[PDB]
């Protein structure tokens, strides 16, 4: 079994606040987190935004959701976007109110923030298993100070955020993760780490885990073979565990924008395909030296089935009957 078998269900609260309820495999309505817990889901990943004008995914939101994830005995993985909105390689907008002109002030704000976030969970008696300083920061973070035109600045900011959590009041300090997208690409993974560490601004001892996103529908180049190699190299070169923190497989995809990787071309777009992909994906992770696990991204986001992809449906929940799919059980036994 995989050390971590999780899912990111950050949207749960906005959905429930909309009259959405889920039925388990037996047709009985039941708190999604409890359905997942019983199905074997290990941990839950939750995205955190700093100051969204509408409170979406802010700290209050995550505390509400994390109390329930704790209630069900699942571990917690906080995905800090260090932004007021969605952060990715194409957009790393510094939180409103934070500095876009002075790195000293910004390193300080980032340190106080990660520290306050952790201190707030400690106040509520909620442990945090994993915490990522940023989301998919391959193109850096907190622009313009953290643009990749300065891996030195990037290393300084990551170091600062890391120490905010190390210095927090959490009885136990959470595992610190650095998350990059395109996890199947070894050259990009390598280039990023080799570079930022060469600056000496970020130390090997500043973080514990490597986290990578892995999707099959954004490039035929994302074969399981490339991922297996990138995963094995990341681990052997830097000696840190590796986690696939985001992934999806469609139950339906009529017109994909890109061709699916060659070694994934045989898998069907159905619930069974989903089950088959996850197993093939867990095998590669399990076969990797320190492969800790996999997290499915937003399997229950009713209303956003495509989940941003060119495919029609990546959910693990029957969007019509609100009943979870059997693949929920597969994720729970990887």
From the number of C-beta atoms within 10 Å of its C-beta (0-12, 13-18, 19+), residue 297 rates as: buried
Tokens of 254: 């009529």
Stated in angstroms to one decimal place, the resolution of this structure is: 2.3
Q: Contacts by 99-106 with C-beta closer than 8 Å and gap 24+?
A: 99/145, 100/143, 100/144, 100/145, 101/145, 103/145, 103/153, 103/156, 103/157, 106/142, 106/145, 106/157
> 46: closest CA among 278, 242, 215, 297?
297
| 192, 138 contact by CB (below 8 A) | yes
d(CA 237, CA 292): 17
> 22: closest CA among 4, 5, 9, 8?
9
Q: In sequence order, what are the beta bridge partners of 59? A: none
Q: What is the 3-state secondary structure (H, E, C) of the chain?
A: CCCEEEEECCCHHHHHCCCCCCECCCCCECCHHHHHHHHCCCEEEEEECCCCCCCCCCHHHHHHHHHHHHHCCCEEEEEECCCCCCCECCECECCCCCCCCCHHHHHHHHHHHHHHHHHHHHHCCCCCCEEEECCCHHHCCCECCCCHHHHHHHHHHHHHHHHHHHCCCCCCCCEEEEEECCCCCHHHHHHHHHHHHHCCCCCHHHCCEEEEECCCCCCCCCCHHHHHHHHHHHHHHHCCCEEEEECCCCCECCCCCCCCCHHHCCCCCCHHHHHHHHHHHHHHHHHCCCEEEEEEECCCCCCCCCCCCCCCECCCECCCCCEECCHHHHHCCC
| 255, 274 contact by CB (below 8 A) | no
Q: Which of 129, 246, 276, 298 is catalytic?
A: 246
d(CA 275, CA 181): 23
Torsion of CA 275, 279, 285, 291, to 10 degrees: 80
Q: How far is CA 27 from the centre of its chain?
A: 29
From the number of C-beta atoms within 10 Å of its C-beta (0-12, 13-18, 19+), residue 73 rates as: exposed
d(CA 44, CA 4): 9
d(CA 122, CA 113): 14
Experimental method of this PDB entry: X-ray
136 among known catalytic residues:
yes
d(CA 216, CA 229): 16
Rounded to 5 degrees, what are φ and ψ at 70? -75, -40
Tokens of 328: 């929920």
From the number of C-beta atoms within 10 Å of its C-beta (0-12, 13-18, 19+), residue 130 rates as: buried
Cis-peptide into 144, omega within 30 deg: yes
Domain range 1-334, CATH architecture = Alpha-Beta Barrel (3.20)
d(CA 117, CA 112): 8
279 among known catalytic residues:
no
> 231: closest CA among 276, 275, 190, 278?
190
d(CA 166, CA 118): 9
> 45: closest CA among 271, 221, 202, 244?
244
d(CA 201, CA 179): 18
Q: In sequence order, what are the beta bridge partners of 43? A: 75
Tokens of 96: 């409103």
90 contacts: CB under 8 Å, gap ≥ 6: 139
Rounded to 5 degrees, what are φ and ψ at 317? -135, 130
Taking residue 195's Cβ as centre, other Cβ atoms within 10 Å add up to: 14
Q: Which of 33, 129, 136, 201 is catalytic?
A: 136
């Amino acid at each position: 079994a995989l050390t971590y078998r999780g899912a990111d269900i950050s949207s749960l609260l906005l959905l429930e606040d909309e009259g959405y309820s889920y039925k388990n495999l037996n047709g009985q309505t039941q708190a999604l987190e409890t359905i997942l817990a019983d199905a074997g889901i290990n941990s839950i990943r939750q995205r955190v935004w700093v100051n969204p004008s509408d409170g979406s995914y802010d700290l209050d939101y995550n505390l509400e959701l994390a109390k329930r994830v704790k209630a069900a005995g699942m571990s917690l993985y906080l995905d800090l976007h260090l932004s007021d909105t969605w952060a990715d390689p194409s957009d790393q907008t510094t939180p409103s109110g934070w500095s876009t002109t002075d790195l000293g002030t910004l390193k300080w704000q980032l340190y106080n923030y990660t520290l306050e976030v952790c201190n707030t969970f400690a106040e509520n008696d909620i442990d945090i298993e994993i915490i990522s300083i940023g989301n998919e920061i391959r193109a850096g973070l907190l622009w313009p100070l953290g643009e990749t035109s300065s891996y030195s600045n990037i290393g300084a900011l990551l170091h600062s955020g890391a120490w905010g959590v190390k210095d927090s009041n959490l009885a136990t300090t959470p595992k610190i993760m650095i998350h990059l997208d395109d996890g199947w690409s070894w050259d990009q993974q390598n280039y990023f780490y080799e570079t930022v560490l060469a600056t000496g601004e970020l130390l090997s001892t500043d973080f514990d885990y490597f986290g990578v996103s892995y999707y099959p529908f954004y490039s035929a180049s994302a074969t399981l073979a490339s991922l297996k190699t990138s995963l094995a190299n990341l681990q052997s070169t830097y000696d840190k565990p590796v986690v696939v923190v985001e992934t999806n497989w469609p139950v339906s995809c009529p017109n994909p924008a890109y061709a699916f990787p060659s070694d994934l071309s045989s898998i069907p777009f159905s619930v069974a395909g989903q089950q088959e992909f996850l197993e093939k994906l867990a095998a590669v992770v399990e076969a990797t030296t320190d492969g800790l696990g996999v997290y499915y991204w937003e399997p229950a986001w009713i209303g956003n089935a495509g989940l941003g992809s060119s495919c029609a449906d990546n959910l693990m929940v029957d969007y019509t009957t609100d009943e979870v799919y059997e693949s929920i059980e597969t994720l729970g036994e990887l």
